[PDB]
Design an enzyme around this catalytic site. Structure first.
Site, PDB file in Angstrom:
ATOM      1  N   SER A  55      47.552 -27.109  -9.050  1.00 52.06           N
ATOM      2  CA  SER A  55      46.303 -27.909  -8.799  1.00 52.06           C
ATOM      3  C   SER A  55      45.070 -27.384  -9.950  1.00 52.06           C
ATOM      4  CB  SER A  55      45.563 -27.658  -7.520  1.00 52.06           C
ATOM      5  OG  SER A  55      46.758 -27.665  -6.452  1.00 52.06           O
ATOM      6  N   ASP A  98      41.064 -27.273   5.432  1.00 54.78           N
ATOM      7  CA  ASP A  98      41.087 -28.541   5.618  1.00 54.78           C
ATOM      8  C   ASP A  98      40.857 -29.117   6.894  1.00 54.78           C
ATOM      9  OD1 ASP A  98      41.979 -28.539   3.027  1.00 54.78           O
ATOM     10  OD2 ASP A  98      43.972 -29.200   3.309  1.00 54.78           O
TER      11      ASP A  98
HETATM   12  C1  HEM Z   1      44.856 -43.069  -0.441  1.00 51.36           C
HETATM   13  C2  HEM Z   1      44.542 -42.464  -1.662  1.00 51.36           C
HETATM   14  C3  HEM Z   1      44.835 -41.282  -2.488  1.00 51.36           C
HETATM   15  C4  HEM Z   1      45.409 -40.140  -1.408  1.00 51.36           C
HETATM   16  C5  HEM Z   1      45.940 -40.063  -0.145  1.00 51.36           C
HETATM   17  C6  HEM Z   1      45.358 -39.053  -2.427  1.00 51.36           C
HETATM   18  C7  HEM Z   1      46.032 -38.016  -2.505  1.00 51.36           C
HETATM   19  C8  HEM Z   1      45.798 -36.734  -2.953  1.00 51.36           C
HETATM   20  C9  HEM Z   1      45.955 -35.305  -2.708  1.00 51.36           C
HETATM   21  C10 HEM Z   1      46.181 -34.840  -1.332  1.00 51.36           C
HETATM   22  C11 HEM Z   1      45.615 -34.598  -3.699  1.00 51.36           C
HETATM   23  C12 HEM Z   1      45.574 -33.113  -3.789  1.00 51.36           C
HETATM   24  C13 HEM Z   1      44.346 -32.648  -2.999  1.00 51.36           C
HETATM   25  C14 HEM Z   1      43.482 -31.727  -4.033  1.00 51.36           C
HETATM   26  O1  HEM Z   1      44.033 -31.274  -5.037  1.00 51.36           O
HETATM   27  O2  HEM Z   1      42.274 -31.719  -3.850  1.00 51.36           O
HETATM   28  C15 HEM Z   1      45.542 -35.362  -4.719  1.00 51.36           C
HETATM   29  C16 HEM Z   1      45.296 -34.997  -6.065  1.00 51.36           C
HETATM   30  C17 HEM Z   1      44.744 -35.942  -7.226  1.00 51.36           C
HETATM   31  N1  HEM Z   1      44.552 -37.202  -7.195  1.00 51.36           N
HETATM   32 FE1  HEM Z   1      44.907 -38.343  -5.284  1.00 51.36          FE
HETATM   33  N2  HEM Z   1      44.979 -39.521  -3.583  1.00 51.36           N
HETATM   34  C18 HEM Z   1      44.462 -40.770  -3.417  1.00 51.36           C
HETATM   35  C19 HEM Z   1      43.785 -41.375  -4.536  1.00 51.36           C
HETATM   36  C20 HEM Z   1      43.572 -41.189  -5.569  1.00 51.36           C
HETATM   37  C21 HEM Z   1      42.472 -41.665  -6.651  1.00 51.36           C
HETATM   38  C22 HEM Z   1      41.841 -43.000  -6.321  1.00 51.36           C
HETATM   39  C23 HEM Z   1      42.401 -40.824  -7.696  1.00 51.36           C
HETATM   40  C24 HEM Z   1      41.466 -41.330  -8.911  1.00 51.36           C
HETATM   41  C25 HEM Z   1      41.600 -40.578 -10.047  1.00 51.36           C
HETATM   42  C26 HEM Z   1      43.436 -40.072  -7.660  1.00 51.36           C
HETATM   43  C27 HEM Z   1      43.657 -38.983  -8.752  1.00 51.36           C
HETATM   44  C28 HEM Z   1      44.068 -37.481  -8.372  1.00 51.36           C
HETATM   45  C29 HEM Z   1      43.796 -36.379  -9.328  1.00 51.36           C
HETATM   46  C30 HEM Z   1      43.388 -36.429 -10.786  1.00 51.36           C
HETATM   47  C31 HEM Z   1      44.289 -35.495  -8.453  1.00 51.36           C
HETATM   48  C32 HEM Z   1      44.323 -33.909  -8.860  1.00 51.36           C
HETATM   49  C33 HEM Z   1      43.977 -32.765  -8.112  1.00 51.36           C
HETATM   50  C34 HEM Z   1      43.820 -31.404  -9.012  1.00 51.36           C
HETATM   51  O3  HEM Z   1      43.436 -31.545  -9.771  1.00 51.36           O
HETATM   52  O4  HEM Z   1      43.742 -30.475  -8.093  1.00 51.36           O
HETATM   53  N3  HEM Z   1      43.980 -39.897  -6.342  1.00 51.36           N
HETATM   54  N4  HEM Z   1      45.462 -36.815  -4.397  1.00 51.36           N
END
Ligand code: HEM
Ligand code: HEM
Lengths: 49, 111, 49, 379
Positions: free
Chosen positions: D205, D228
Site C-alpha cells: 500500500s 474500517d
Molecule cells: C467499485 C470501485 C472500486 C473498488 C471496490 C476499489 C477497491 C480498492 C481497495 C479496497 C483498495 C485498497 C484500499 C486502500 O489501499 O485504501 C484500492 C486501492 C486502490 N485503488 Fe481502487 N477501488 C475501486 C475503484 C477505483 C478507482 C475509481 C480508482 C481511480 C484511480 C482506483 C484506484 C486505486 C488506487 C490508486 C489504489 C492504491 C491504494 C494505495 O496506494 O494504497 N480504484 N481499491
C-alpha cells in the site's frame, strides 16, 4: 503437595494466571515476524480472538 | 545564486526562496533529510543498496520515527527539526554513479 | 558498434519487424472488413463483388 | 498441531490478505474509502436484488412498479432509497478514492491504477443505465441527450446509436436491455475489484508520507478492521441520514412524473455525479469536440501517471503542488455547480473558463509545478 494436584487443580490454577492476563514480551534479534501485541494479547483467550 | 532563474525572485533576493521553501515543504519537521523522502525507483533502490551500514541504518530510523510522527499526526519539537543548512545529501554521490552507470549501459545498447 | 551513437541499433531492430508489422496490419484490416462485410472494401475483389 | 499452520490448503490462504497483510502504520482516514467502496458494492447489490424482485422492465409497467414498491411492499420504501442514495454515497466514495491517489501519488502503482480507471468507467456506466430504469421523464430524457451524443461519431454514429437504442429512439426496447445490463455489470465489478486488489497486494500500500513503509508495517486484523468498521458506520450514518431525513434531497423532483416523449422537462440534466462532465461537453459548441472532451476528461486519469515530474511521490512535502491540487478540486466543484445550471450568458463564460482550466492544470500546471520544486530542492 504434589500428590494433591490433579486435572481440576491444574485447569483452575492455570486459568487464574494464564487465561486472559496481559503478558510481558521481550524480543531480540530478527523479530520482524514477531506478532503484534494485540495479536499476542488475543492469544490469551479462546473462541474470541 | 539560487531560487529562480531571475537574478532576484519575487520575495526579495534569490537564496532565501529555497530556504523559505524548505520550511514550507515540512519534511524537516518530521525529522527527515531531503534524500529520505525521495521516490524509490529501480535506480534509487540500487543506490540505497550501496549505502554504508552506518548511513543506511541511520536512514532507517529517521524514516521509522517519521512514520510514528505521521501516524500520530504530530511533529518533532522546534529544536529537533532538520536545519536547512545542516541538511546534507547523503545519497547524491551514490545516485550520480547509478546515473553514470545507467547512461553508459543504455547508450551502449544503441550502437 | 561505432563509438556509442544515438539509437542506431533500435533502427535496425525496427526494420526487422516492419515487414511482419505491415502484414500484421492486414489482419486488422481484412479481419475487420471480414467481420462486417464493409461495403466499400468488398468491391475490388473479383469473386466477392 | 500448529495453530499457525491453519486450514491452509483451503481458501483461507487467500484470506491471509485480510488478516496478516502488512500495512503502513501511518495510514490516514482517506484510505478507509477503499473498504467503503466494497461495502457500497455489497449494499448496492443487496438492495438491488430485492428491488429486482418487484421491478418490471416493460414501459407500460415500469414507473407504476416503482410506485408499487414504495406504496405496497412492506418496508419496500426504504430499500428504494438506500439504492437511490447508495449511488450518491458510491460516487462520493468513488471521487475521494481517486482524489487520494492524485494527492498521495498512488498512480505509481501502474497496474492497480489502470484497473481503477476501468472500475470507474464500469460504475458510471452502471449508474447511468440504472437511472433510466424508473422511467420518469428524467430517466427518458436524461438518457435521450447523453445517448444521442454517440451520433456525433463519424461514419458509425447512427449505426451504433440505433444499436444501443434497439430502435429509432429510446423506448421499451431500450428499457428492457438496460435492466438486464444493469443486472450483470455490478457482478463484473466484483470480479474486477478482486483483480484490482491482486495488483496492489503484490506491491503493498501507500502512505501519506510517500516513502516506503516496509520498516513500519503492522498487521491488518487488529488495527484496520476496527478502523474500517468505524469508517463503515460513518458511511451508514451518512447514507441513512439522507434516506431517513431527506430522501429526495439529491434527486431531481421532475423524475416523479411518468416519461412522456412528447413533452420536455423544464431543465435537462444528469445526476449530480455526472454534472461535472456535462459542463465540459457543453463548453464546446462543436458536437464532435464535446463528446471527445467528455470522454477525454474521464479518460485523463490513465494519462496522469505519465505526467509525474517531482522526485517525491506524495504531495505531503510539495506545497506548490498542494496549492494546485485544491485549485483542481475547487474547479471540479465549479464544474459541478455550473453543470446543473441552464446555458446562459454568465454560465457560458464561466463554463468555458472552468473547463479550459481543468485540462490546463493537470496537463501543464501540475507537471510544471513538479519541475519547479525539483529545481528548488537541489535535484
Ligand atoms: C467499485 C470501485 C472500486 C473498488 C471496490 C476499489 C477497491 C480498492 C481497495 C479496497 C483498495 C485498497 C484500499 C486502500 O489501499 O485504501 C484500492 C486501492 C486502490 N485503488 Fe481502487 N477501488 C475501486 C475503484 C477505483 C478507482 C475509481 C480508482 C481511480 C484511480 C482506483 C484506484 C486505486 C488506487 C490508486 C489504489 C492504491 C491504494 C494505495 O496506494 O494504497 N480504484 N481499491
Ligand atoms: C454498482 C452497482 C449499482 C449502481 C451504482 C446502481 C445505481 C442505480 C441508480 C443511480 C438508480 C436510480 C434510482 C433512482 O434514481 O430512483 C438505480 C435503480 C435501480 N437499480 Fe441499480 N445500481 C447498481 C446495481 C444494481 C443491481 C445489482 C441491481 C439488481 C440486481 C439493481 C437494480 C436496480 C433497479 C430495479 C432499479 C430501479 C428501481 C429504483 O430506481 O428504485 N441495481 N440503480
Amino acid at each position: 503437595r504434589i500428590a494433591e494436584v490433579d486435572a481440576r487443580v491444574v485447569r483452575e490454577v492455570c486459568s487464574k494466571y494464564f487465561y486472559d492476563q496481559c503478558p510481558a514480551v521481550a524480543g531480540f534479534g530478527p523479530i520482524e515476524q514477531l506478532p503484534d501485541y494485540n495479536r499476542i494479547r488475543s492469544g490469551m483467550f479462546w473462541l474470541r480472538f | 545564486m539560487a531560487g529562480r532563474p531571475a537574478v532576484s525572485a519575487s520575495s526579495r533576493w534569490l537564496e532565501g526562496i529555497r530556504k523559505w521553501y524548505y520550511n514550507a515543504a515540512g519534511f524537516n519537521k518530521l525529522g527527515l533529510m531531503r534524500d529520505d523522502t525521495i521516490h524509490e525507483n529501480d535506480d534509487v533502490k540500487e543506490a540505497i543498496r550501496r549505502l554504508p551500514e552506518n548511513l543506511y541504518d541511520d536512514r532507517v530510523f529517521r524514516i521509522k520515527r517519521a512514520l510514528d510522527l505521521s501516524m500520530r499526526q504530530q511533529i518533532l519539537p522546534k529544536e529537533q527539526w532538520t536545519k536547512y543548512e545542516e541538511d546534507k545529501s547523503y545519497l547524491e554521490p551514490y545516485l550520480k554513479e547509478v546515473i553514470r552507470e545507467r547512461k553508459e549501459r543504455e547508450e551502449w545498447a544503441k550502437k | 558498434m561505432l563509438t556509442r551513437f544515438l539509437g542506431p541499433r533500435y533502427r535496425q531492430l525496427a526494420r526487422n519487424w516492419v515487414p511482419t508489422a505491415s502484414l500484421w496490419g492486414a489482419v486488422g484490416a481484412v479481419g475487420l472488413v471480414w467481420a462486417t462485410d464493409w461495403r466499400l472494401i468488398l468491391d475490388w475483389v473479383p469473386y466477392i463483388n | 498441531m500448529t495453530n499457525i499452520r491453519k486450514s491452509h490448503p483451503l481458501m483461507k490462504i487467500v484470506n491471509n490478505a485480510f488478516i496478516d497483510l502488512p500495512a503502513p502504520s501511518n495510514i490516514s482516514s482517506w484510505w478507509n474509502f477503499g473498504s467503503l467502496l466494497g461495502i457500497c458494492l455489497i449494499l448496492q447489490i443487496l438492495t438491488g436484488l430485492f428491488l429486482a424482485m418487484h421491478y418490471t422492465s416493460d414501459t407500460t409497467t415500469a414507473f407504476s412498479s416503482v410506485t408499487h414498491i414504495c406504496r405496497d411492499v412492506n418496508y419496500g420504501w426504504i430499500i428504494r432509497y438506500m439504492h437511490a442514495n447508495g449511488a450518491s454515497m458510491f460516487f462520493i466514495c468513488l471521487y475521494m478514492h481517486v482524489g487520494r491517489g492524485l494527492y498521495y501519488g498512488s498512480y505509481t502503482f501502474l497496474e492497480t491504477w489502470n484497473i481503477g480507471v476501468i472500475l470507474l468507467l464500469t460504475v458510471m456506466a452502471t449508474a447511468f443505465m440504472g437511472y433510466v430504469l424508473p422511467w420518469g421523464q428524467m430517466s427518458f430524457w436524461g438518457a435521450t441527450v447523453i445517448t444521442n451524443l454517440l451520433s456525433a461519431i463519424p461514419y458509425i454514429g447512427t449505426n451504433l446509436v440505433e444499436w444501443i437504442w434497439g430502435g429509432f429512439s429510446v423506448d421499451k426496447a431500450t428499457l428492457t436491455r438496460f435492466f438486464a445490463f444493469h443486472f450483470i455489470l455490478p457482478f463484473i465489478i466484483m470480479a474486477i475489484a478482486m483483480v484490482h486488489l491482486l495488483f496492489l497486494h503484490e506491491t503493498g500500500s501507500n502512505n501519506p508520507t510517500g516513502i516506503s513503509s516496509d520498516v513500519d508495517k503492522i498487521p491488518f486484523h487488529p488495527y484496520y478492521t476496527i478502523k474500517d468498521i468505524l469508517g463503515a458506520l460513518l458511511l451508514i450514518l451518512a447514507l441513512m441520514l439522507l434516506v431517513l431525513f431527506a430522501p429526495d434531497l439529491l434527486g431531481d423532483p421532475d423524475n416523479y412524473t411518468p416519461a412522456n416523449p412528447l413533452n420536455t422537462p423544464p431543465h435537462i440534466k444528469p445526476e449530480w455525479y455526472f454534472l461535472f462532465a456535462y459542463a465540459i461537453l457543453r463548453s464546446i459548441p462543436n458536437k464532435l469536440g464535446g463528446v471527445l472532451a467528455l470522454a477525454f476528461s474521464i479518460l485523463i486519469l490513465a494519462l496522469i501517471p505519465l505526467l509525474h515530474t517531482s522526485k517525491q511521490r506524495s504531495m505531503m512535502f510539495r506545497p506548490l503542488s498542494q496549492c494546485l491540487f485544491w485549485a483542481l478540486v475547487a474547479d471540479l466543484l465549479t464544474l459541478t455547480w455550473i453543470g446543473g445550471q441552464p446555458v446562459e450568458h454568465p454560465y457560458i463564460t464561466i463554463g468555458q473558463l472552468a473547463s479550459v482550466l481543468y485540462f490546463l492544470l493537470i496537463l501543464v500546471l501540475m507537471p510544471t509545478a513538479g519541475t519547479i520544486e525539483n529545481k528548488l530542492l537541489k535535484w
